[PDB]
């Protein structure tokens, strides 16, 4: 019922500012208090701010003239904005709800803005089909892949048959060779399903908003 | 500001009861710093556990209790669980302000073990046209968490162009993780025995390919 949904590029250059918008469902504004935390890599959650239900605010005291946090209730939307961001301003951001007393706790999150603070340019993936090595026995199961190479910065999400596909599925966490990122996806299928038919992995990089298909044909 | 101290990470068996503490930098924790307790699971998925006045959310399980002992604020869970396997972050209320703990890395061990599933990909023709070629070695469904990746080409163990992930949990709990081997399309045409050996729990699974 309850969802708080992110959108925020992601790409901040030095001394440049971040905007993310946390759109709610399944609660109003008005009820709720919506707060601001981080995570960096290399640490735990950090605290950035919070705009209460009657619309009030507080924020963590070094940031003050760099963060603001304001709302429209009627959009059902809640904006962060920060300026001047720097290196160590590099982390996945959230939006959390927190009730009233007796709904107060942070009980649901939004998913997190990946937020890759550099001088670097993008670059999309380079997305290439993996088909097996050796050719399936008769009604057996097969196994595709899904090379997703050298891209910056992160996020990028790997679906099969636009989402149809799941159960098979498994989606690695990526590698960072030499300032560039590369992860995999594959999927099990059995061999009556390929390659009698279409099996497609799709490839979305948010950041450069590249959507590129690959179809899986026999090697 | 204050700096809120918790411990590091703590490793129980199931059916353990721990306690995992809240601390302040400048002074005893009391109820008017309304002590929240925040849980992590893989894939950074946050979910509130204790509230402000140590209410639960509805679904929270009843093992989990928040309090206050003597100068610091706790969490005590009666009972580990396997799903209890997170990190678990305080959160302490400064008049103006909240501040979270480093968080504590909660480690259930006795999980039923499993042996990894091994698949070695072949790299892509598209991939040779533009004379580059990398090999895609996937590990599937491991517990422990540890894993050692080696390569061999033609049986002669290789030195560069290798990259293997840390190991991060899969939906069903289970660890997945991938190594590379980055080559030339050259050095491609000449080896024809390659050879993704892995190593868990003193065991080793393998899977070769050959063009
Ligand atoms: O709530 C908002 O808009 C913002 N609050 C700002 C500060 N709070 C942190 C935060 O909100 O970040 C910490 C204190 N709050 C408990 C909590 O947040 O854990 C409540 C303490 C209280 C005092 C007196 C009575 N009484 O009945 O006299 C009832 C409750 C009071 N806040 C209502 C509520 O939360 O119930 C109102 C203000
Ligand atoms: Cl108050
Ligand atoms: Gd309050």
């Known amino acids: 019922q309850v969802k708080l949904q992110e959108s925020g590029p992601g790409l901040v250059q030095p001394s440049q500012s971040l905007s993310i918008t946390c759109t709610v469902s399944g609660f109003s504004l008005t009820d709720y208090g919506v707060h601001w935390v981080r995570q960096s890599p290399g640490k735990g959650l950090e605290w950035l701010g919070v705009i209460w239900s009657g619309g009030g605010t507080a924020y963590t005291a070094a940031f003050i003239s760099r963060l603001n946090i304001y709302k429209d209730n009627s959009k059902n939307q809640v904006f962060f904005e920060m300026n001047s961001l720097q290196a160590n301003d590099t982390a996945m951001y959230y939006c959390a709800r927190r009730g009233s007393y007796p709904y107060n706790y942070f009980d649901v999150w939004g998913q997190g803005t990946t937020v890759t603070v550099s001088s670097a340019k993008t670059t999309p993936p380079s997305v290439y089909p993996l088909a097996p090595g050796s050719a399936a026995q008769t009604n057996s199961m097969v196994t595709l892949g899904c090379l997703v190479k050298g891209y910056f910065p992160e996020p990028v999400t790997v679906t099969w048959n636009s989402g149809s596909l799941s159960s098979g599925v498994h989606t690695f966490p990526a590698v960072l060779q030499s300032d560039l990122y590369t992860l995999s996806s594959s999927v099990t299928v059995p061999s009556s399903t390929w390659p009698s038919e279409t099996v497609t992995c799709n490839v979305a990089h948010p950041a450069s908003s590249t959507k590129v298909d690959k179809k899986i044909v026999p090697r | 500001q204050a700096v809120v101290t918790q411990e590091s990470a703590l490793t129980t068996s199931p059916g353990e009861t721990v306690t995992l503490t809240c601390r302040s930098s400048t002074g005893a924790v009391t109820t008017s710093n309304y002590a929240n307790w925040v849980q992590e699971k893989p894939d950074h998925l946050f979910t509130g556990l204790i509230g402000?006045?140590?209410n639960r959310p509805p679904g929270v399980p009843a093992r989990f209790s928040g309090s206050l002992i003597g100068d610091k604020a706790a969490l005590t869970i009666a009972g580990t669980q396997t799903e209890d396997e997170a990190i678990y972050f305080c959160?302490?209320?400064?008049?103006?302000?909240?501040?979270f703990g480093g968080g504590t890395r909660l480690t259930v061990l006795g999980q039923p073990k499993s042996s990894p599933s091994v698949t070695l990909f072949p790299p892509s023709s598209e991939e040779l046209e533009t004379n580059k070629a990398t090999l895609v070695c996937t590990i599937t469904d491991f517990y422990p968490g540890v894993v050692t990746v080696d390569w061999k080409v033609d049986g002669t163990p290789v030195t560069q162009g290798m990259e293997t992930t840390q190991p991060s949990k899969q939906s069903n709990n289970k660890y997945m993780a991938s190594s590379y081997l980055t080559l030339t399309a050259r050095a491609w045409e000449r080896h024809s025995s390659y050879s993704c050996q892995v190593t868990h729990e003193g065991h080793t699974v393998e899977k070769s390919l050959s063009p």
């Open positions: 959160a302490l209320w400064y008049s103006n302000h909240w501040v």
């Open positions: 402000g006045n140590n």
